[PDB]
């Protein structure tokens, strides 16, 4: 169900949030480092149904971020559907280590055959939001690597379409 969030603004009436129509829809795009919105626990790929009550269906993301600039007051409301994209697959390393994907730039590119990533029907073109329960949104590639590299056998993620 969605949940709502409450938010107060900085001085320039910021929150931390980028945004990004998709399908008539508004997501969260880039969620700031100590932030009001990471404080409320928006993330990467949450949907943002209404800011103040408004419906933010068929918006551009202009439109989202001049909503939230010109908002009165202090204090912004949002109605927020968690990452309605996300889905969580679970591989187990093979008898050298690997799982069996290729990632660049935090997006999986190729599913190595006949991998524990094969057999689980990982697919390409999808964002890895969280490495069994590391948020690697913002990472760098090597960073995720050290993530896999240290993992045990069981290595849960979470993954979106990159859309």
């Known amino acids: 169900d969605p949940r709502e969030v409450i938010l107060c603004k900085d001085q320039d009436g910021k929150i931390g949030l980028r945004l990004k129509s998709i399908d008539n829809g508004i ?10 919105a990471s404080l409320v626990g928006l993330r990467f790929g949450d949907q943002v149904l209404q800011i103040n009550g408004e419906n933010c269906a068929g918006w551009s993301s202009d439109k989202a971020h001049k909503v939230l600039k010109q908002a009165f007051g202090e204090k912004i409301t949002m109605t927020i559907r968690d990452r309605p994209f996300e889905r969580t697959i ?3 390393k093979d008898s050298t280590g690997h799982v069996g994907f290729i990632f660049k730039n935090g997006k999986i590119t190729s599913i190595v055959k006949d991998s524990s990533a094969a057999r689980n029907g990982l697919l390409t073109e999808h ?14 590639d090597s960073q ?14 979470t993954i979106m379409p990159a859309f």
């Open 127 to 140: 964002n890895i939001c969280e490495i069994n329960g590391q948020n690697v949104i913002g990472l760098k």
């Open 90 to 92: 679970t591989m187990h």
């Open 144 to 157: 995720i690597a050290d993530i896999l590299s240290t993992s045990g056998t069981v290595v849960t993620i």
């Open 27 to 36: 997501f969260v795009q880039l969620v700031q480092a100590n932030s009001p």
